[PDB]
Structure 1
Amino acid sequence: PNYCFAGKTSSISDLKEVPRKNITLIRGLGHGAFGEVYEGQVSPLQVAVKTLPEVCSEQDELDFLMEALIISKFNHQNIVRCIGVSLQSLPRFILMELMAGGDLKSFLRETRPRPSQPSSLAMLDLLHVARDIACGCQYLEENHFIHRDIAARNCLLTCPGPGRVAKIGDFGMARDIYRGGCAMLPVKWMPPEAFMEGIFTSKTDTWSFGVLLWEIFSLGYMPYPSKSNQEVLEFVTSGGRMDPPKNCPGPVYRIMTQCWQHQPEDRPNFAIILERIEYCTQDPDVINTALPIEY
C-alpha cells in the first residue's frame, strides 16, 4: 500500500524502522479509546509513542501504517515530527516528537488565568498559538493536503511555558478519507458545503481554523455552547455564527467571521489569515487587552 503526497510516492519501506531494543517506555500520557500513547526514549532521544493494539483488524493495521506514512512525509516546523516507527515488533509503534505541553484544548482549560495565577496567559500567547497553527495550515494548503479536522484537540504544544510552539499533531480524519459515522463527525468544525454535499477544499480548513480561533480565544470552551451537533448544523446553514469569546478583541473576532463566510470563495486562504494574525499582534490595543480571570 502506497502513499502519495506532493509529487512523491512512498511505501512502508520508506519509514524509518527503529530497533525495538532501542525503545523504552517511560509513562502513559493519557491513553485514548483505541491505542495508547506513552512518553518514551530512543537510544537519549525523547519521544511520544503511539501504539497499535495487538488485538486489531487488518483494516486497523492498514490505518496505522497509513498514519505513519502521512506524518513521516510532512516537513514543517508546525507539524509534529515522526522520529520513526517500530512495525516489525508487536505491539507496533509510531514514534513522534514529544510535545510536553500536551494538547491545546487541555492546555487552554488548565492554563486559564485564575486569581492565584492571574498572569498565566496573555493575548499575545494566544495569537502566537494561532499563528503557529495557521503556518502549519498554510503548509498543508500549499501542498494540497486537506486536514478536515482542524481543532484544538488535534494540536500540541512543545512545552507549557513561555517559549511554547503549537503544532498540528493528529491526522486521523485525513487518514480515514485517504483510505466512521455521523455521530463521530466534527460537525461543529465543518462548513455548510462540507456536511451537506461532502465537498472538501482547503477552504474547508479555513472554516475549521475559524472555529479553532474561537476555541483559542475562549480559552478552551466547546464551540457553540449548549448546542448539539444537529442544532449547530441547522444554525450554521441558516447563517448563524458564534458570538465573540469573552473579551475577544474586535480585530481577532473579524478573522473568525471571515473564516466563516458562507461561500468558500469569500473565505481567506491561510496566507491572508497569517497576514491578519500578524497585524493583530502588532496592534497595542489588541495585545494589551486583558483576558478574563476565571473565579
Structure 2
Amino acid sequence: DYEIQRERIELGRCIGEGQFGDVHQGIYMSPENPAMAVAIKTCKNCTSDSVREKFLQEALTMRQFDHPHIVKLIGVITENPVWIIMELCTLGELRSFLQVRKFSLDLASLILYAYQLSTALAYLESKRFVHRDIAARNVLVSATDCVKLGDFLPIKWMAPESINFRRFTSASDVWMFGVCMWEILMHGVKPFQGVKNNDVIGRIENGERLPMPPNCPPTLYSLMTKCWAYDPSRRPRFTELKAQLSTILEEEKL
C-alpha cells in the first residue's frame, strides 16, 4: 500500500520544475518511522484524468524498483491535488551540482557518479526494463558520493534507431548513458550545444560524435565511444560498463 494521507505530508519550498508541475521538498511524518525529508511531485493539469493517468503512471512504474541509485518512491496522494512522494536527494539536480561545484569536484568523483548510474542501469537491464531517457538532467545528487537516477524529444541524447525508427532497447539506453557519461565528464554541459536538433541525426549518421571532454581519461572516453556504435548490437551491456567503470575509477583513485 502506497496511499499516504495529505495530513502526514508537510509541504515545503519548491525545489524545481518537473515534467508535470512544480516539485517541492517536504517532510513525511510516518506514524511508524522517523520523519524524513521528501520530494513532493505536484501536478497541474491533473484535473483532467487523461493527464492524471500519465502523472500517476510514473509512480506505478517506480514502485517496481528497489535500488540504491534509483530515487525511491515513498507514496502517492491520489485525491486532488495529486502528489507523488519520493525520497529527497538533498544536494539537488546533477547538472546544477556539477556546474556549481565544477572546481571542487575531482575526476574520480565524476567517474564514481558514472559508475553508480551504471549500477542502476545494470539493475534496470536485469529487470529487462528500458528507461528511454538517460541524461544528466534525470539524475539527482543525494550526497557528494551518491547519485540516483530519476524520471520514470531529447534528440541530442537519443540513439540513431530511436530517432529513425522509434526503437528503444537496452542497447539504446546504452547509447544515452554514453551521452550522460559525457555530460558528467563535461561538468553538466549539454551535448551538441549550438547545434539544432534538426542537424543531429545527420551528423550522427555521418559518424560525428561528442569529443573527449577536457581532463577526461582516454580510457573513459573509449568507453563512451563504444556506447555510440551505430550498430546497436556492437554496443556493450550495462554489466560490462559497470565493470570497466569500476576499473577506471579504482585506477583514478590511485
Distance 2:159 2:182 in 1: 15
Partners of 2:174 and 2:238 within 8 A in 1: yes
For residues 264-283 of structure 1, give each alpha carbon's deviation from its aligned partner in whole angstroms, at most 9, with x where no partner exists: 11110000001111111122
Question: Given the alignment, which residue of 110, 132, 153 partners 1:126?
Answer: 110
The equivalent of 1:35 in structure 2 is: 21
Structure 2 counterpart of 1:169, which letter?
G
For residues 110-168 of structure 1, give each alpha carbon's deviation from its aligned partner in whole angstroms, at most 9, with x where no partner exists: 1111xxxxxx1001100110011111111111111111110000011113x4xx31111
Q: CA deviation at 1:32?
A: 4.2
Q: CA deviation at 1:30?
A: 2.0
Q: What value does the CA root-mean-square deviation take over the aligned residues?
A: 1.5
Q: Unmatched 5+ residue regions in structure 2? A: 30-34
Q: Secondary structure at the match of 1:148?
A: coil
Distance 2:114 2:232 in 1: 21
Identity, in percent, stands at 39
Question: Given the alignment, which residue of 61, 69, 78 partners 1:87?
Answer: 78
Question: Given the alignment, which residue of 137, 145, 150 partners 1:153?
Answer: 137
Q: Normalization by structure 2: what TM-score?
A: 0.94
Change beyond 3 A, Cα 1:133–1:72: same
Q: Determine whether 1:107 maps to 2:102.
A: no
Distance 1:168 1:108 in 2: 15
Q: Determine whether 1:166 maps to 2:147.
A: yes
Q: CA deviation at 1:18?
A: 0.9
The equivalent of 2:88 in structure 1 is: 98
Distance 2:234 2:53 in 1: 38
Partners of 2:185 and 2:216 within 8 A in 1: yes
Question: Given the alignment, which residue of 225, 236, 240 partners 1:268?
Answer: 236
Runs of 4+ in 1 over 6 A off after TM superposition: none
Partners of 2:46 and 2:82 within 8 A in 1: no
Distance 1:268 1:134 in 2: 12
Partners of 2:113 and 2:146 within 8 A in 1: yes
Q: Determine whether 1:59 maps to 2:40.
A: no
Distance 2:137 2:207 in 1: 26
Equivalent residue pairs, number: 249
Distance 2:130 2:204 in 1: 21
Q: Unmatched 5+ residue regions in structure 1? A: 1-14, 114-119, 172-184, 289-295
Distance 1:79 1:218 in 2: 22
Partners of 1:133 and 1:166 within 8 A in 2: yes
Distance 1:224 1:16 in 2: 41
Distance 1:143 1:71 in 2: 12
